[PDB]
Amino acid sequence: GLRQYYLSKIEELQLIVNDKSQNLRRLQAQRNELNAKVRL
Amino acid sequence: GIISLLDEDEPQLKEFALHKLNAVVNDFWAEISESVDKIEVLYEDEGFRSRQFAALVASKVFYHLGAFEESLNYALGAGDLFNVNDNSEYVETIIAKCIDHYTKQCVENADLPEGEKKPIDQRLEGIVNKMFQRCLDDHKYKQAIGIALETRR
Amino acid sequence: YLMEGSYNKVFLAKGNIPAESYTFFIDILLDTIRDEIAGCIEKAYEKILFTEATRILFFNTPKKMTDYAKKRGWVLGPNNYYSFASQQQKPEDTTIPSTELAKQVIEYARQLEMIV
Amino acid sequence: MSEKKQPVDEDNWDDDNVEDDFSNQLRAELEKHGYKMETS
Amino acid sequence: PKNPDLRIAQLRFLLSLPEHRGDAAVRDELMAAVRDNNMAPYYEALCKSLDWQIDVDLLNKMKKANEDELKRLDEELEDAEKNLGESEIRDAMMAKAEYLCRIGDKEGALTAFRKTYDKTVALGHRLDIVFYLLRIGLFYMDNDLITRNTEKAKSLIEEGGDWDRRNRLKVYQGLYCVAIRDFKQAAELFLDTVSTFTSYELMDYKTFVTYTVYVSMIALERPDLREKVIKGAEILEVLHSLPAVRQYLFSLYECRYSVFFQSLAVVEQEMKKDWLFAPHYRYYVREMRIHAYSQLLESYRSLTLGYMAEAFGVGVEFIDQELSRFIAAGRLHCKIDKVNEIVETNRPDSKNWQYQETIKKGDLLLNRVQKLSRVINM
Amino acid sequence: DLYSRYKKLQQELEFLEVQEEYIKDEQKNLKKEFLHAQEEVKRIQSIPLVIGQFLEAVDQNTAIVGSTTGSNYYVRILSTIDRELLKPNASVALHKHSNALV
Amino acid sequence: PPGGGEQEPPPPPAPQDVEMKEEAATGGGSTGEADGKTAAAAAEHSQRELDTVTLEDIKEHVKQLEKAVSGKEPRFVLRALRMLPSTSRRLNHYVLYKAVQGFFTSNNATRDFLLPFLEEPMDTEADLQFRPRTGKAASTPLLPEVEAYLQLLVVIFMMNSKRYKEAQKISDDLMQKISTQNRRALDLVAAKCYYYHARVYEFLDKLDVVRSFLHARLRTATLRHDADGQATLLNLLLRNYLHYSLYDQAEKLVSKSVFPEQANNNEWARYLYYTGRIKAIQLEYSEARRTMTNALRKAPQHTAVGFKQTVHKLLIVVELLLGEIPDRLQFRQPSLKRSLMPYFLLTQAVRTGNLAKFNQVLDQFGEKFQADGTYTLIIRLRHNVIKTGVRMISLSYSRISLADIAQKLQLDSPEDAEFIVAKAIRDGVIEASINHEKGYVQSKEMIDIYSTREPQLAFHQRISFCLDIHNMSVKAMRFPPKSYNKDLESAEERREREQQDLEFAKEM
Known about the structure:
This is part of a larger assembly, with seven protein chains of seven kinds. By secondary structure, chain C is mostly helical. Chain C has helices spanning about 10, 25-40, 65-70, 95-110. Chain D is an all-alpha fold. Among the domains of chain G are: about 275-400, no CATH class; about 445-475, no CATH class. Chain G has helices spanning about 5, 15-20, 25-30, 45-55, 70-75, 85, 90-95, 100, 130-150, 155-175, 185-205, 210-220, 230-240, 250-255, 270-275, 275-280, 290-295, 310-315, 340-350, 355-365, 365-370, 375-380, 380-395, 400-410, 415-425, 455-475, 495-505; strands spanning about 400, 440. Chain G has a two-stranded antiparallel sheet. In chain G, helix 9 (about 130-150) runs antiparallel to helix 10. Chains in contact: A-B, A-F, A-G, B-F, B-G, C-G, D-E, D-G, E-G. The interface between A and F is medium-sized, with 19 and 20 residues. Chain D: This is 26S proteasome complex subunit SEM1. Chain D: Belongs to the DSS1/SEM1 family.
């Protein structure tokens, strides 16, 4: 059942990526505006 | 409506009750889902002649309700009648529980398998390589190489 | 009629059972009203003699009233139901806010300054 | 815009509360005072 | 012109809404409709009227007379541009747009007023145009178009004093704040009654006196009614010609409680047949009842309920059902007894009642912003 | 191959988890570092200070003053000054060498 | 023929103008960008499909003389649609069938000719593996069949077209649904065809073996993919389970699928409504009114809104059960006014204390309340009228005889006038005593609630909530920070020129 066992993990792992990566891009750009305030 | 006749103590009503617990397992699945779970009582009462099919319908009904191990320990102890039927969309639901539970057990048993080891059921270990025999004989060896690492053996 | 306070019109329906016997059902409906009035005898009532609240259920004068008058209060006296209408012990509690609000004020400062 | 997928099918407010009060109570209360003086 | 134009709007109210009274009002308005070149504002008023089957020749003599004044603008706009004054095309019809405001609808007015608004460089012609925009904003009840140009009016008066452009302006918010149910502003706009001149819309100044006294007896209490409208020489002599209103106002002040309702029945009936109070005639008296009740009740504490029959208004059970519905309404701070036949008062602080109106507005504003933040950002 | 499709894809969840924890450190650490320079800039205001007068501003954060030495200048600001405390004809402070608003 | 040949010939090409631009742009896109590269979590073809649902609802009405839609089917159904060098001839076929309508006559599809318009996915190397094409090439004929619904010996043409779509649906259920959004894009096509699968069956057919088919449709959901299959398969599960007495309500308590956590703002908005009536119909009052209100304010900007006509009725049924009542006509419309006047007259009686005034409603508009299906809720308001009355009377009068309240409430009996007051203190509406021997009910003047904790509870509900919306106005605000391209320090060149100018001064 390698169709219904192994491929059931590729379908799951991509769901954790597609919001925790969005969590970073919101957060690092939040620092990036803050870093612009510091050096200036 | 067959849930009310679960206190007869004549056993032949229970095999007449479990005859309806499979084909219409989706509509009064609403009913005997959380209110009645009296499978484990007759499962432990020394009849037996049943408790085989009794653990199937609780492996059905605790599956969708997130109690996967409650289904899985019943899926272990149900025996042959649980594993006699694998031509459905339900066999993908149960090997994604058991083999996943198997490999997350064996990672712990990759650490310390000696001393306080877990009660590895022979059905818990015997459908691992059986499905791996289903992989050795169905021509796929990009995944026969795979689970052979994933068994950590 | 059991939803609102109405009790007499309930037992006018116990004068009107048209369909079949309904006997075991209204007798439980007797019993769950018996403790209800023995519950609701405990309101702010004055002295009542042994006739007025003696007939509020059904009974003329058996010893069944002594079963109720010794179950709860309204003490058997000289034709009297004694009122212990106190309701005095519970107030003047600053501490119950002072435990709970000290929790809530900190919860205001959680979603006020620290980034979430 | 303006879709709503269909599965099934001042000048106004203060007088509404005033319509609530005298809905059926003394609309043209004009002449009963002429008839209450000799009674009361 | 728009100077006799408000009487038309009252007479249209006089036509329809009194249902049996629909015969002399359709005669005297038609006496003004099929003359003075009126074409537009009465087609549905003819449909609210009877058939009047031959009005076609009545229209054709007037739509031609509409055109004759229209084409003499068309005979002026080429002679005024050949030797130009201060845009004498516009400068001619900046006075003749108000005719076309009366004769046509707002469209011939609105594109010509905003035309000539860019013409004049002093506000003395601008600010008179804005007053023309206000007065049509009342007939077509343009409650959103008055909000713009009132600020656009008020922004012009500050340079100069312009008190005939200010004190006239205060009348327009005064009739607007009484058009809406806002009485504590309408007595505040009608505060002066000195420079309020013998105007066009309340052609009797004494009618303006009747309006400013009816709103004053709600809006202010009696440390201020006992100084402002009882002592004003400008206000005492103008209702000295009125036997009704003088008796109606003073009975509240003289504590003549029983005769107070007698003329209150007169005013409220008159308030119904009057235009512009008839949207809120039921709201007036129920505020004047509760003001006449609580004035008497806050003097004493142990006043029996059978004393108010023979001194204040007859009918004991009439007083009973009336006071029961106002205490239950949450006002009129007292507490009535029933079987020992007495009315008891209390006194609450200005804390619980002042807290009550805060929690209404706090819920209302949060209802506004939570619904807004869902609408924007998808 | 298919076996690498999950093993390499779980390999980066290992790698992704640090980064959101990492910027979580810097949401607070720069604030404790920005406040160091927030007070550090006011060394310029120290003692030897001269007096000019505000005239106008070209734009945000840059203006034109006239010194009490008579000559006008095109100067810079200091950012902590509330700009809405300026210009009736505002007497200002200027740096004695670099000659900007203080 | 002059009336024919001047009014009939422009209804073919002007739809052919817009049908080469709305679904041909969808067919040019959703074949090559759903089965193609991607149409991600921010897709466009789903909203484009929404635009090709809402347009064709009121687009077609007529029985299609001049083959104006009757010739679209032998045009649009002969489509291979495999790849661009084989559809470059199909792009000509979007014009080649136009002269079939024009030079000649086509086959006029009038209630009979839908059988030779459905058997085509064998014709000219058509497939089912490209189900972003074929599931759309299911739906593109599956809509305008059932858009008119036409219900005159047609149902089997709808059904056979659904069976062919069910053949695509089972291949969606089984064959290769991983990461092509074959489940995701067709869960909409599942959900959108279900409303035509329902209204046919809610007209002339059964309802309940589709339910067991829907459970297996729900069984395959949430295991393989976990978006918009958890959502629509539960509102479409509820739609007659509410309207039946089957168990289905404590099931939806122990349903884990209560949250799909995102459901495209229109199926999510009524999702809280369908479960909002569930707590209402089984007596859960105070919990229901907050998910009724949330079901009202997540709704779009349309006008013909007859379900919003229903929730605005139902939302303040349950608040009459609790006591609060807003002004319901605060958004009154030319279409809302006639749907309020019986129901607005109902709450006229509740805010009063009269008893048979409720009965003057319940015969005048008893038949209308069953037509809306709300009568079992209306019948229990007699308990709430009398608790509103006893609060009104005890707050108005202080020392009132119990043999006076009954004649005012037209109770016709003083012997139970004690008895409602007994439960009024048991429930705790009024506090004070009754002199049962005399007959008067005294009440204490309870003033100064200002020195009590209870207005802080009105604060603490609203303090914390307004701090939440300040958080959401931060959490929904930091997305347009983007393209902050480069914080430049000062220069390369002018920095070097600054260094050269400094070196000049040091030499000086």
